[PDB]
Amino acid sequence: PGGVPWIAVGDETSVTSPGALRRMTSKDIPETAIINTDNSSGAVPSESALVPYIDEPLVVVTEHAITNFTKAEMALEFNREFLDKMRVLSVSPKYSDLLTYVDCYVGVSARQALNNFQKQVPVITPTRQTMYVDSIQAALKALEKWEIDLRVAQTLLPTNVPIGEVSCPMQSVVKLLDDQLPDDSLIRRYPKEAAVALAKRNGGIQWMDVSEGTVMNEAVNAVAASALAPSASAPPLEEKSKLTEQAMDLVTAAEPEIIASLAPVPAPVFAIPPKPADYNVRTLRIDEATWLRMIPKSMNTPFQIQVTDNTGTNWHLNLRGGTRVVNLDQIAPMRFVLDLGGKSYKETSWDPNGKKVGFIVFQSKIPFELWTAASQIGQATVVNYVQLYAEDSSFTAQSIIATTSLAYNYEPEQLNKTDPEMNYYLLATFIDSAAITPTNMTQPDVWDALLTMSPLSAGEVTVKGAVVSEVVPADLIGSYTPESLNASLPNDAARCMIDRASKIAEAIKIDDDAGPDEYSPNSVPIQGQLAISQLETGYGVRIFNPKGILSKIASRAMQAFIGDPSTIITQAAPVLSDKNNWIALAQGVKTSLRTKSLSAGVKTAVSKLSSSESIQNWTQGFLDKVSAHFPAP
């Protein structure tokens, strides 16, 4: 039990209400005070003028803390010899001598504590606990260099073999270790202490006794070694447990139920930290990218407009046929970076070097297609602009534009959005303090450059280029053609689902080891669904397949999922497009993992044993080299 102790308020052993209990202090138990400490560590001052005398509370110590601090002290006890050499902490802390055993009421609140009377509970004050932690922490602090040098000595040559046993005369090891160990090391100064510490840590190292003669194993950690050791037919126990636990953690993180829901799920609960994406706006096709607009082509009347930024400077620019813009409505916050490096934009009538390119934002109630003569432009200002530079190009008699990082942040909250009729647009093009004659400059825009978009929110999700408030994860399966996937926005739901499913794929690969066309517990869920579905009645010609064909198809489905985790999204996928298969696999993964009973696969075990035996052989060869090049007397 934990919490704090409670005592009666003086009543004659008749406590019938939580109003007759008060919290215990060190005056009620005088042995828990600061002056009654045994002070074997010398921490508390002996001067009577320096030791305080005030009332501190009490807390209850639980068995978990007792055992863990008791093992923390044995961590220090691994190095008693060097600690003796520096005259540090001559007496072991012995946590159990700090607690006080009292029969009292135990609890966090009085109402609970009243109905719970316990006998022989251990209590302590905060001050003594802090002192004990400080003593261990100081003893640990005094051993940093010694531990590092000890680890260097252990790791200089292999002292552990994966399986079996190896050997070497110790004189050869000592000669090599004298030859190679650093001069700064404390091993050279204090050899015997290091020898005893290594003999305690490692059971392999055994020191013969000159007085008597008996040489024997003296390590203190054999049980943990047996927990790590491999049997001659199976891997170690601890490694299997660790692997299965890691796979379970991945499945838990992937949220198998969120990605298999048949009812709408809110956007913030479905989302994950996104990634930026790159595009070329000019090269996109407008019927695929639903988030672009373009003025009708074959128009034969270019027009010019003027526009002023937030400093009032006037700028001239021209719109022509083919000019493209981007809808800035219903796309959530987003950051744009545009880079024109490597492109020319060179004509005989216009040279880019020294010119300026800018982002221009338009607000108007008229669709961008129906624009002409500058009367339809509406309210507009320049956001940002930058000046270009030209350099020689690999192609002879041409030149290219140096790098740029033209940036703009779109935050939907600031703009008024008062009239739903209103439309917002964004464009990038040349601007100049002199009017650009249409004959000289013919390029519709400068959208022929690399464009990186990064989301500015983590609770916003779109589909196909328009934001939604909720999604049904089971309705995204098999609904994207490849062309619609390279034109979606970085905050798309498909990317979130793919990234969530990648963890399921990783967990399955970690747990399962099956070759081509072999059944596994993680591939039969598809098989049962395939059988039941092929029995049913829909429309069209039925085909019946035996159990072997179905098993092969299910295995191929699972492999195609693991290798490429975005097939669930892809339209017209062979078998993984159906939502039943996805739901069955996702649900069955948890049951498959939870019912392992400390086991592994046959192929893994056999390969692992062969590998370990090869490792011992190589280790033995190296030790033969060492014993041969450093002869013993």
Partner 1 sequence: MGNASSIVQTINVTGDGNVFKPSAETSSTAVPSLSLSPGMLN
Partner 2 sequence: ANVWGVRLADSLSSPTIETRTRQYTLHDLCSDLDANPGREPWKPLRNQRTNNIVAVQLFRPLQGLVLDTQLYGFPGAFDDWERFMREKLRVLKYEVLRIYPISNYSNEHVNVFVANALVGAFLSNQAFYDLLPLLIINDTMIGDLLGTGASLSQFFQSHGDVLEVAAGRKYLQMENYSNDDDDPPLFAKDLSDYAKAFYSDTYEVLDRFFWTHDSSAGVLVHYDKPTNGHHYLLGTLTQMVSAPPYIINATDAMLLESCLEQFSANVRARPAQPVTRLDQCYHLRWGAQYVGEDSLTYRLGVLSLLATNGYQLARPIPRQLTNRWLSSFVSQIMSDGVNETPLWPQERYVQIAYDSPSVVDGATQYGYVRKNQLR
Residues 241/249, Cβ–Cβ less than 8 Å: no
Dist. CA 482–CA 488, nearest whole Å = 10
The backbone torsions φ and ψ at residue 111, rounded to the nearest 5 degrees and listed phi first, read: -65, -45
Give the x/- contact pattern for partner 1 in 545-584, rule: CB under 8 A.
----------------------------------------
Q: Judged by CB, which is closer to partner 1: 126, or 341?
A: 126
Stretch that binds partner 2, among 11-19, 134-142, 160-168, 211-219 (CB under 8 A): 11-19
Stretch that binds partner 2, among 17-25, 362-370, 454-462, 552-560 (CB under 8 A): 17-25
State whether the Cα torsion 260-261-262-268 is positive or negative. Answer: negative
Shortest approach of partner 1 to residue 116 CB, angstroms?
A: 19
Interface residue with partner 2 among 3, 7, 20, 474 (CB under 8 A) is 20
Q: Judged by CB, which is closer to partner 2: 15, or 250?
A: 15
State whether the Cα torsion 263-268-270-275 is positive or negative. Answer: positive
Residues 307/528, Cβ–Cβ less than 8 Å: no
137 lies in the binding site for partner 1 (CB under 8 A) = no
Stretch that binds partner 2, among 7-15, 58-66, 172-180, 232-240 (CB under 8 A): 7-15
Q: Judged by CB, which is closer to partner 1: 247, or 501?
A: 247
Residues in 176-195 that interact with partner 2 by CB under 8 A: none
Interface residue with partner 1 among 40, 68, 109, 130 (CB under 8 A) is 130
Interface residue with partner 2 among 16, 46, 349, 416 (CB under 8 A) is 16
Residues 6+ apart with CB under 8 A from 608: 235
Shortest approach of partner 2 to residue 114 CB, angstroms?
A: 11
13 lies in the binding site for partner 2 (CB under 8 A) = no
When CB distances are held under 5 to 8 angstroms depending on the partner's kind, the choice from partner 2, partner 1, none that residue 130 binds is: partner 1
When CB distances are held under 5 to 8 angstroms depending on the partner's kind, the choice from partner 1, partner 2, none that residue 22 binds is: partner 2
Residues 6+ apart with CB under 8 A from 280: 448, 449, 450, 451
Q: Judged by CB, which is closer to partner 1: 1, or 126?
A: 126
Interface residue with partner 2 among 4, 7, 11, 596 (CB under 8 A) is 11
| Residue 447 burial (CB count, 10 A) | 24
Dist. CA 26–CA 124, nearest whole Å = 9
Give the x/- contact pattern for partner 1 in 225-264, rule: CB under 8 A.
----------------x---x-------------------
Shortest approach of partner 2 to residue 10 CB, angstroms?
A: 8
Breaks (C-N over 2.5 A) in the chain follow: none
Cα end-to-end span (Å), the chain: 63
Stretch that binds partner 2, among 16-24, 201-209, 304-312, 366-374 (CB under 8 A): 16-24
Q: Judged by CB, which is closer to partner 1: 30, or 126?
A: 126
When CB distances are held under 5 to 8 angstroms depending on the partner's kind, the choice from partner 2, partner 1, none that residue 16 binds is: partner 2
594 lies in the binding site for partner 1 (CB under 8 A) = yes
When CB distances are held under 5 to 8 angstroms depending on the partner's kind, the choice from partner 1, partner 2, none that residue 545 binds is: none
| Residue 476 burial (CB count, 10 A) | 21
Amino acid at position 257, single letter: E
According to the 3-state scheme, what is the secondary structure of 153-205?
A: HHHHCCCCCCCCCCCCCHHHHHHHHHHHCCCCCCCCCCHHHHHHHHHHHCCCC
| Residue 609 burial (CB count, 10 A) | 18
Q: Judged by CB, which is closer to partner 2: 12, or 413?
A: 12
591 lies in the binding site for partner 1 (CB under 8 A) = no
Dist. CA 357–CA 385, nearest whole Å = 5
Residues in 434-473 that interact with partner 2 by CB under 8 A: none
Dist. CA 451–CA 359, nearest whole Å = 13
Shortest approach of partner 1 to residue 598 CB, angstroms?
A: 9
Q: Annotate 89-126 with DSSP letters as a single string.
A: --S---GGGT-EEEEEEEESSHHHHHT-EEEEEEEE-H
Interface residue with partner 2 among 2, 3, 19, 302 (CB under 8 A) is 19
Total of chain residues touching partner 1, rule CB under 8 A:
5
Stretch that binds partner 2, among 9-17, 181-189, 424-432, 584-592 (CB under 8 A): 9-17
Dist. CA 441–CA 357, nearest whole Å = 13
Three-class secondary structure of residue 307 per DSSP: strand
When CB distances are held under 5 to 8 angstroms depending on the partner's kind, the choice from partner 2, partner 1, none that residue 17 binds is: partner 2
Q: In DSSP terms, which residues pair with 317 in a beta bridge? A: 305
When CB distances are held under 5 to 8 angstroms depending on the partner's kind, the choice from partner 2, partner 1, none that residue 594 binds is: partner 1
Shortest approach of partner 2 to residue 3 CB, angstroms?
A: 20
Closest CA to 343 of 446, 234, 263: 446
Total of chain residues touching partner 2, rule CB under 8 A:
9
Closest CA to 252 of 593, 556, 493: 593
14 lies in the binding site for partner 2 (CB under 8 A) = yes
Q: Judged by CB, which is closer to partner 1: 151, or 594?
A: 594
Q: Judged by CB, which is closer to partner 1: 509, or 594?
A: 594
When CB distances are held under 5 to 8 angstroms depending on the partner's kind, the choice from partner 2, partner 1, none that residue 14 binds is: partner 2
Token readout for 168 is 């070497």
- Count of H helices and E strands in the chain? 16, 22
The backbone torsions φ and ψ at residue 119, rounded to the nearest 5 degrees and listed phi first, read: -120, 135
Q: Judged by CB, which is closer to partner 2: 9, or 224?
A: 9
Cα distances (Å, whole numbers) of residue 597 to 107, 178, 562, 592, 600: 38, 49, 24, 11, 9
Q: Judged by CB, which is closer to partner 1: 27, or 594?
A: 594
Q: Judged by CB, which is closer to partner 1: 40, or 130?
A: 130
Residues 251/589, Cβ–Cβ less than 8 Å: yes
Q: Judged by CB, which is closer to partner 1: 487, or 593?
A: 593
Shortest approach of partner 1 to residue 521 CB, angstroms?
A: 17
Dist. CA 510–CA 245, nearest whole Å = 11
Token readout for 165 is 């046993």
Q: What is the CA 487 to chain-centroid distance, rounded?
A: 28
User: For the packed helices 579-594 and 237-254, what is the interaxial angle rounded to 10 degrees?
Assistant: 140
Contact residues: partner 2, CB under 8 A: 9, 11-12, 14, 16-17, 19-20, 22
Contact residues: partner 1, CB under 8 A: 126, 130, 241, 245, 594
